């Protein structure tokens, strides 16, 4: 690929510069380059990979939602809205395919620490979930199963190997709860998971880590906000 001639350490360095410059497409390309070196990522490098791709797919999801809403209101006038929505949909699917490729080809392993294993499986669930937001038909049920399966395996590892305040565990549980509510039409499963996750964190609040408590406390509030929303 285009990053094949660049040293791993220079790709990490440029990913951090791209983050500073808010060039998230470049940042994703640099981190895809680093992953393709075939060494493991540290916690700090997983953060760079996560931020870069989430920003890229974020803008695509927001674009797609704007276009989809114009299209549905227009289905209440030419092929232009459908054509342009399809164009943005195709690029979004391209980016989710790239991420799922990296996870399956390089990052997801039987070995590694719990943090890495849970993080990658959470990431697999999220990018299957993003495909599911725009999917229809035979492709779709395949996508929703793949997301649930990745999330459940992640949940199994997290409850066994991590404290209940761990920010990867909390973020995974937040995101599985969103899968249940927004994708799987299972509001009951969502509310149950979110409430269990909040209550168990608060019960074992003493388990907060000195280096991550601000992240844990933020996710705990987002589970509370979703519970208020789902009432």
């Amino acid at each position: 690929g285009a990053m094949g001639s660049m040293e791993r350490a220079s790709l990490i360095q440029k990913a951090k510069l791209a983050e500073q410059a808010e060039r998230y497409e470049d940042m994703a390309a640099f981190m895809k380059g680093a992953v393709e070196k075939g060494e493991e990522l540290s916690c700090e490098e997983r953060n760079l990979l996560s931020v870069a791709y989430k920003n890229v797919v974020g803008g695509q999801r927001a674009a797609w939602r704007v276009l989809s809403s114009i299209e549905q209101k227009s289905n209440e006038k030419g092929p232009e809205v459908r054509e342009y929505r399809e164009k943005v949909e195709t690029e979004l699917q391209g980016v989710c395919d790239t991420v799922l490729g990296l996870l399956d080809s390089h990052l997801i392993k039987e070995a590694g620490d719990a943090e890495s294993r849970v993080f990658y499986l959470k990431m697999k669930g999220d990018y299957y979930r993003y495909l599911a937001e725009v999917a229809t038909g035979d492709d779709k049920k395949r996508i929703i199963d793949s997301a649930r399966s990745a999330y459940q395996e992640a949940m199994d590892i997290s409850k066994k190997e991590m404290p209940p305040t761990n920010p990867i565990r909390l973020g995974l549980a937040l995101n599985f709860s969103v899968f249940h509510y927004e994708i799987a039409n299972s509001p009951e499963e969502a509310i149950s998971l979110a409430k269990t996750t909040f209550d168990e964190a608060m019960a074992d609040l003493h388990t907060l880590s000195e280096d991550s408590y601000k992240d844990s406390t933020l996710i705990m509030q987002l589970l509370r906000d979703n519970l208020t929303l789902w009432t």
Partner: peptide, 11 residues
């Protein structure tokens, strides 16, 4: 309207 997911917060 939409449920909130884990944010893109630098760790």
């Amino acid at each position: 309207i939409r449920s909130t997911s884990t944010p893109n917060v630098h760790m």
